[PDB]
Amino acid sequence: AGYDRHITIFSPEGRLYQVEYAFKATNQTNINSLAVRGKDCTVVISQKKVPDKLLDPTTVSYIFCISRTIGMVVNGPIPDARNAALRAKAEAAEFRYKYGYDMPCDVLAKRMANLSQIYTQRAYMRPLGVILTFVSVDEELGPSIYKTDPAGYYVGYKATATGPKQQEITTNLENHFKKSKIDHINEESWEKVVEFAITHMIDALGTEFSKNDLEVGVATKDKFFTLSAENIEERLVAIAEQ
Amino acid sequence: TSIMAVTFKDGVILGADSRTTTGAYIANRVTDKLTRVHDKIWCCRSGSAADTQAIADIVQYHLELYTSQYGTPSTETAASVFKELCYENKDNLTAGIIVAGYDDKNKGEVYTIPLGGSVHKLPYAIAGSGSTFIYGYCDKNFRENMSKEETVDFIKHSLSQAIKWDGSSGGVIRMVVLTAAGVERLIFYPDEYEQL
Amino acid sequence: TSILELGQLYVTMGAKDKLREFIPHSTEYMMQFAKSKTVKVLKTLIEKFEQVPDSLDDQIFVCEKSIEFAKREKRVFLKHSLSIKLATLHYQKKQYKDSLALINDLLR
Amino acid sequence: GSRRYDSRTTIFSPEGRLYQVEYALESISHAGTAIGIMASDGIVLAAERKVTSTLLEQDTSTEKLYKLNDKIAVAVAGLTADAEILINTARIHAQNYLKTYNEDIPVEILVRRLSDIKQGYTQHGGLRPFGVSFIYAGYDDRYGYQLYTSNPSGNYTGWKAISVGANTSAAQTLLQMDYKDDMKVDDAIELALKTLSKTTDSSALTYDRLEFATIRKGANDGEVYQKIFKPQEIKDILVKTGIT
Amino acid sequence: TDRYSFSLTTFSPSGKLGQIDYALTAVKQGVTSLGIKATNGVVIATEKKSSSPLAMSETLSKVSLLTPDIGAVYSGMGPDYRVLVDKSRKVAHTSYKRIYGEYPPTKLLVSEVAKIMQEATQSGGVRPFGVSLLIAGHDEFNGFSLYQVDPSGSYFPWKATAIGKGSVAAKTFLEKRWNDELELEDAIHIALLTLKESVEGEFNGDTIELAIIGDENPDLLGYTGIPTDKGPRFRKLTSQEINDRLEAL
Amino acid sequence: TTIVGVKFNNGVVIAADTRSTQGPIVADKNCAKLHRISPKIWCAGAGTAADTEAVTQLIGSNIELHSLYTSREPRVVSALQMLKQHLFKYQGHIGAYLIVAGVDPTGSHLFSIHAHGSTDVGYYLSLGSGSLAAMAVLESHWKQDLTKEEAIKLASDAIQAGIWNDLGSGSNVDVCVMEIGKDAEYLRNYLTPNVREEKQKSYKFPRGTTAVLKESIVNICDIQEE
Amino acid sequence: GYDLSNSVFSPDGRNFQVEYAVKAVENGTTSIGIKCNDGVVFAVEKLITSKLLVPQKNVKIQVVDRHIGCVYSGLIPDGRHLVNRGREEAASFKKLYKTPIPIPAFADRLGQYVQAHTLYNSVRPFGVSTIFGGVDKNGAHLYMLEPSGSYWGYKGAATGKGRQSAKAELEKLVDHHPEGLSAREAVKQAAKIIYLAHEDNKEKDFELEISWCSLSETNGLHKFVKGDLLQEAIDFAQKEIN
Amino acid sequence: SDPSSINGGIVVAMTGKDCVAIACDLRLGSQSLGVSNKFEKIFHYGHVFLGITGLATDVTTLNEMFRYKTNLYKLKEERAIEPETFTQLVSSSLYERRFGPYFVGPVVAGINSKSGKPFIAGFDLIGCIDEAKDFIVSGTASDQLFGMCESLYEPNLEPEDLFETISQALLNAADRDALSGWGAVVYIIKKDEVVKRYLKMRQD
């Protein structure tokens, strides 16, 4: 039939082209992120762009607070970003209620993952075109980053980046942990991990940043906070004085 | 059972007595009734141990989900989750729940919610079976915005009359302090409050 | 645990007559072991013997005896492994006519 | 939207005919042969496996042969997944009959019930058929030994000799010439074997590629011994008939 | 509304079902996994793969546990495997650990999961899961058993088999390498050696995932002082144990 | 039927007895009332027998399914919660009285759940029918900071004195000592109360004493062969 | 075909349907939202089709709750469904939590409803743009909601035909007043740029409707500007454009 | 008064060595009237034996319910269903008729044929796995039975002596019962063969 990729049906090549089309639509906000594991923290930095002077700059955001321990960073269209932010919130209430402790990030990776499969198995549900980066600090697994993607595939990371220019970032992170020879930076405080992160991003993307063009989210132990433009301004001066 | 909360200058202090009976036999006399369902909005359970516990989870489920979508809920707001659920299970279940919280705007507030489900703003609240004895002591001796140490010894003297006369209450007196500073635990042993 | 440290016993060692002797008694020990991981182990004892020269004759002898057991007690895999090493002892001692005949016969 | 992309495969053709039923019948001659031959003393069911590999385990396999109850077993030929389902539907039906009347099901009744199940899928609901063909060997006292084939449309006819699956036309011609009304079970076993030796879709015909099973009156006191043979008992009776 | 309840799998004019013909190709576009059945045990071994090398691989599982005696391993799609492992477990508890209060035999577990594939072949709003599973397990009464469940919903027992993209070559290698009695010690060396002809990748314990349904381990019991039950017969092999065997090939 | 659980800061001991009753008749002389929700979470049950056993099955399944999807080891608090909801929707018509004892990646634990949906905390709990008698013993000889060697004596003697002050109690004391960082230790029949007194006469009878009015033979072991 | 619906995907990241919904909103009349210090001020250009009409007797600004103004452009009937839905959702929240709904909460809700209409075969994504705001107790906020389910904070937003004239003039107003302006002073500003936005629409004649929600004029309720205050605005603008 | 006591009847089951025995009385009537002695209360499914007491209707409905499941087991698994998982099966079907309880008492008796080890198990009402390896008693005169069994039994008997013991344990108990007195069957069950001997027992 001429219908063969309107629905989530295999091709002669044995493939789901429909699902592939989601991954070509995870790059429309053209924002880039990089997220690195310290020793006792996790740090995730993303670009901010406003297209006009006439928006309010605060509300423009891509780093969405899910649990009070699990941050979530979104690459791809903001309509499907929100639908992804909501579902996740729903499961976080749901886990505490029935199991009597806060949701582990690890478990949020599989639930939201299995849910993604269910959208590519119904022949009437269009998958979310958002790559989610989940950052956390767990006590049972330590600092972790889990990346889910529109297929429902996922794996763990030692560091990871996402975005259309994200190849460039992959060079910086690969070279960096090649020299350290370990999966995590030996640094005992979140401050200097924000300082490191911004440095590889300046190298990779080739442009230096400002306070109003950054957006930073930090997972510490037992709380998840986002830093404001003022706290980000402090960090930038201290890269220069290293 | 005997619980109360009473406002003060910088917030509220919440107070309870930790004896928990089934019939004549105390099941456990160290059992806390002071419950965190949000981290600045605490509550005090009474009536049947089952009934209140189930309600405290379902109310936790709805303030967790509030805080992730719309920011932290006010004390006013948490009381209204309790209200409408007590409404549905008025005849099915029983509860006494006194809802006490710190807000960063209007300071500390105390709402009281009987078993039928109604809210009533008040500067002080008593509930349990410890509270039909101590009624008169609480109202003669109260003045709003009293110093912190005066609150501490009032709730103490109040709860020492509750344990003295009602035998359903007892154990340690515990308190939770909601302030700008944070959440601070107090505990007073039997040998302390009998003198005081 | 016992076989790996019996490997030090046969050959390490410093060039002796006892080293010589010890390798023909390693093939005797092989037959007692009689299991799957005997096959891999045998080859390495033989390599250490090769590495340090101790009696021309005797080297060729131990390989031949092992190829005999390698079709009767142990499987096919052993026999061609040992046969490559027999080919190597021939070519290095510069017997090219023997090494050729050996190679051709394998290789169909 | 949805109505646009709707297959509509459960409508009649201009011929009045159901394309998907025929397509099901087309695909079962791509699965192995299963034959039933009715002797007067028993029933031989002889199936040729549609797979074989020396790395296959085909020894715990009963991948064509199923017991529905201890008196009625089936030979299956077609898409095995669809077939598995009906097999536990059938068990559920047998046990139901047994619950309510406290008497085993006659062969007439269970064959009518499976057939009505099939009928529903081709009749409506926009589904595709369950492409399976069953050869039912069974014993009941009321009509004795009874042999049956049903097809994916959901229609049944009784037979004295039948073949299903691969080379249906071929096996039929042979059966007609070498049948006799009354045989012993052995003569039947022989004939079962002989037809599969001339129809085999590989030149060779072997025990490990035969599933073979009978129901015999060699149980005394007028009872029927359902026997699914071990492949080492198949090996001897195949040397007996002199094939191998 | 919705009106996807019409089958999306239909017979083809030439016969055979198109959608299951498509799904099987997909299994040979995947990773490679194999299983060898020994006399006294069963082994499965597969490759671990990720997008980038900076991704972990200990937080990913392609040998998964159904029961303490039964593991599964796949070749095909990662997303499609993940959901069916969960459903495999859910049906194993609800229909056999509630009604017999114990774990199901391997044949009985196989069959349950074959129904789930089956309704992904029948009805609307489903297309087949694109995996082939091996289900090796042990039950007491038929001993060691190895199965293969395919995209179509049939099952097959085998004596040794492989699935994935390097499949046609791998079963040829294992044809001469299979023996009538093979020990589990010997088998472990075999599976590694076959999957070494099939994998180019840097060959450590950290990329080759090994799991055995060997023999019972009373130390993975989790309790003591009960001599009546015995521990898991499954035992997932972590990187260190495979590293010794690397050196012994 | 009595349950003690004794939390200490090294582990936890939970002990209960093997006499089950169905009214004044003793239903069973040994039955294991110590159930394994999980390997690391053992509970015991008092109260209605047919309701304890069956609901350790429900949650045993549900906790294993859960742990497999989380790929982390169970919480104790997970067991307690599953039970709580389940009991409460029947509104106390399942009369489960459990002491849910367990080690986990948070440490040693001891919880209680009662037959209405009520849950209590403590480092010593006592529950069940013979509770009252075990409770009395405990408070005199307890202190916090026990070892496993202190704790195991105190619990087992409270169970032994519960026999001798209750009529539902009796027969063998089973104890399970679950330490942190170890496999749980089912020291069954830690304390024998008493050995059954030797009777003074053999009562095995002559053969052919009874009469047989008719008989027949059926072997259901086989269906009629070839 | 892959250019026809919403559940389809195409390998350009386009999902052609949704983009076509903006083209509906582009046939609408100008609607502006002026974000002031004290609240929000909406105005809508209302075309007078014929002299047969009964004047000032159609409201294109409909209230939701008692404190959230809502004005929409695109398909007029289609928009009326979206507002009815946000009046249900406001009423559900008012009951369950006994307070008037926050505006970031009202945002979540509506946002979800239109996003929903891109994931099923049997629905069409609504082609309307909304502009909604008011005063809640966390302060005044304003949101514009795209038919794609995209939205942001805004110090001034617009949509409609004369979104071309209106936008340039809103830049002018944040550079006039970059420390903001009063809600009273802003009545005269909404008149001025609605009048200028009828020089892309001068084939007809029109009526100006102005409504406000500001704390300091209306006690935080969504009211209409009416009587003599409304004609002062009309005169002001009328004389500038002459 | 209560349903189970209307219909009467008793079941006794006692392990020996390498063997077991299950036995019943065959009275089955309602209230005063004895109606039938042509009613057996021991049923079997392969080599698991199930005798059952209490309400006469729930006897005959568990006979059908259990039967249907042990068919599905035999066809699927292709081996007979073992007594040890049959015990779990009994618990689970009762317990889901938790509310609307069955007023019954199953007594499961069998031999694990893979070790030769004798196995008994009990139930009353809606569950309760009455473990023993000595005996299980049920029915409306469990008191009578219970006395006979606890004193007579010496562990690990010979099958012939197990027959003497169980014949007595039913006989004396039954005529100090008013809900029994009509007939009796004793199944001596070796792990290779099944002897049924109907005893002589005086009429009520």
UniProtKB/Swiss-Prot annotation, chain B:
Subunit structure: The 26S proteasome consists of a 20S proteasome core and two 19S regulatory subunits. The 20S proteasome core is composed of 28 subunits that are arranged in four stacked rings, resulting in a barrel-shaped structure. The two end rings are each formed by seven alpha subunits, and the two central rings are each formed by seven beta subunits. The catalytic chamber with the active sites is on the inside of the barrel.
Active-site residue numbers: 1 (nucleophile)
Family, per entry: Belongs to the peptidase T1B family.
GO biological-process terms attached to the record: proteasomal ubiquitin-independent protein catabolic process; proteasome-mediated ubiquitin-dependent protein catabolic process
Record bears the keyword Hydrolase: yes
Origin species: Saccharomyces cerevisiae (strain ATCC 204508 / S288c) (Baker's yeast)
Lineage: Eukaryota, Fungi, Dikarya, Ascomycota, Saccharomycotina
The encoding gene: PRE3
GO molecular function terms attached to this record: endopeptidase activity; threonine-type endopeptidase activity
Reactions catalysed according to its record: Cleavage of peptide bonds with very broad specificity
UniProt cross-references to PANTHER family, sorted A to Z: ATP-DEPENDENT PROTEASE SUBUNIT HSLV (PTHR32194:SF0), METALLOPROTEASE TLDD (PTHR32194)
Transmembrane segments: none
Protein's recorded name: Proteasome subunit beta type-1
Main subcellular location of this protein, as a coarse class: cytoplasm
Subcellular location(s) of the protein: Cytoplasm; Nucleus
GO cellular component, one term: nucleus
Additional remark text: The side chain of Thr-1 acts as a nucleophile, and the N-terminal amino group acts as a proton acceptor. Present with 7250 molecules/cell in log phase SD medium.
Keywords: Acetylation, Cytoplasm, Hydrolase, Nucleus, Protease, Proteasome, Threonine protease, Zymogen
Swiss-Prot record, chain E:
Xref: CDD domains: proteasome_alpha_type_2
Main localization of the protein described in the UniProt heading: cytoplasm
GO BP: any one term: proteasomal ubiquitin-independent protein catabolic process
UniProt entry keywords in alphabetical sequence: Cytoplasm, Isopeptide bond, Nucleus, Proteasome, Ubl conjugation
Lineage: Eukaryota, Fungi, Dikarya, Ascomycota, Saccharomycotina
GO cellular component: nucleus; proteasome complex; proteasome core complex, alpha-subunit complex; proteasome storage granule
PANTHER family per the UniProt record, alphabetical: PROTEASOME SUBUNIT ALPHA/BETA (PTHR11599)
Cross-link annotation Glycyl lysine isopeptide (Lys-Gly) (interchain with G-Cter in ubiquitin), location: 107
UniProt source species: Saccharomyces cerevisiae (strain ATCC 204508 / S288c) (Baker's yeast)
Subunit structure, interactors included: The 26S proteasome consists of a 20S proteasome core and two 19S regulatory subunits. The 20S proteasome core is composed of 28 subunits that are arranged in four stacked rings, resulting in a barrel-shaped structure. The two end rings are each formed by seven alpha subunits, and the two central rings are each formed by seven beta subunits. The catalytic chamber with the active sites is on the inside of the barrel.
Record-given protein name: Proteasome subunit alpha type-2
Coiled-coil region: none
Misc remark: Present with 7060 molecules/cell in log phase SD medium.
UniProtKB/Swiss-Prot annotation, chain G:
Chief localization: cytoplasm
Subcellular location per the Swiss-Prot or TrEMBL entry: Cytoplasm; Nucleus
One GO-annotated biological process of the protein: proteasome-mediated ubiquitin-dependent protein catabolic process
Source species, domain of life: Eukaryota
Maturation and modification: The alpha and beta forms are probably products of the same gene with different post-translational modifications.
Residues in the signal sequence: none
Keywords attached to this entry: Acetylation, Cytoplasm, Nucleus, Proteasome
GO MF: mRNA binding
Cystine crosslinks: none
One GO cellular component term: nucleus
Function comment: The proteasome degrades poly-ubiquitinated proteins in the cytoplasm and in the nucleus. It is essential for the regulated turnover of proteins and for the removal of misfolded proteins. The proteasome is a multicatalytic proteinase complex that is characterized by its ability to cleave peptides with Arg, Phe, Tyr, Leu, and Glu adjacent to the leaving group at neutral or slightly basic pH. It has an ATP-dependent proteolytic activity.
Family of the protein in this entry: Belongs to the peptidase T1A family.
Subunit structure of this chain's protein: The 26S proteasome consists of a 20S proteasome core and two 19S regulatory subunits. The 20S proteasome core is composed of 28 subunits that are arranged in four stacked rings, resulting in a barrel-shaped structure. The two end rings are each formed by seven alpha subunits, and the two central rings are each formed by seven beta subunits. The catalytic chamber with the active sites is on the inside of the barrel.
Note: Present with 12000 molecules/cell in log phase SD medium.
Curated annotation (Swiss-Prot), chain H:
Cross-link position per record: Glycyl lysine isopeptide (Lys-Gly) (interchain with G-Cter in ubiquitin): 69
Molecular functions (GO terms): endopeptidase activator activity
Listed GO CC annotations: cytosol; nucleus; proteasome complex; proteasome core complex, beta-subunit complex
InterPro entries: Ntn_hydrolases_N, Proteasome_beta_3, Proteasome_bsu_CS, Proteasome_sua/b, Proteasome_suB-type
Keyword field: Cytoplasm, Isopeptide bond, Nucleus, Phosphoprotein, Proteasome, Ubl conjugation
Phosphoserine: residues bearing it: 30
Homology family: Belongs to the peptidase T1B family.
Subunit: The 26S proteasome consists of a 20S proteasome core and two 19S regulatory subunits. The 20S proteasome core is composed of 28 subunits that are arranged in four stacked rings, resulting in a barrel-shaped structure. The two end rings are each formed by seven alpha subunits, and the two central rings are each formed by seven beta subunits. The catalytic chamber with the active sites is on the inside of the barrel.
Official protein name in the record: Proteasome subunit beta type-3
Lineage: Eukaryota, Fungi, Dikarya, Ascomycota, Saccharomycotina
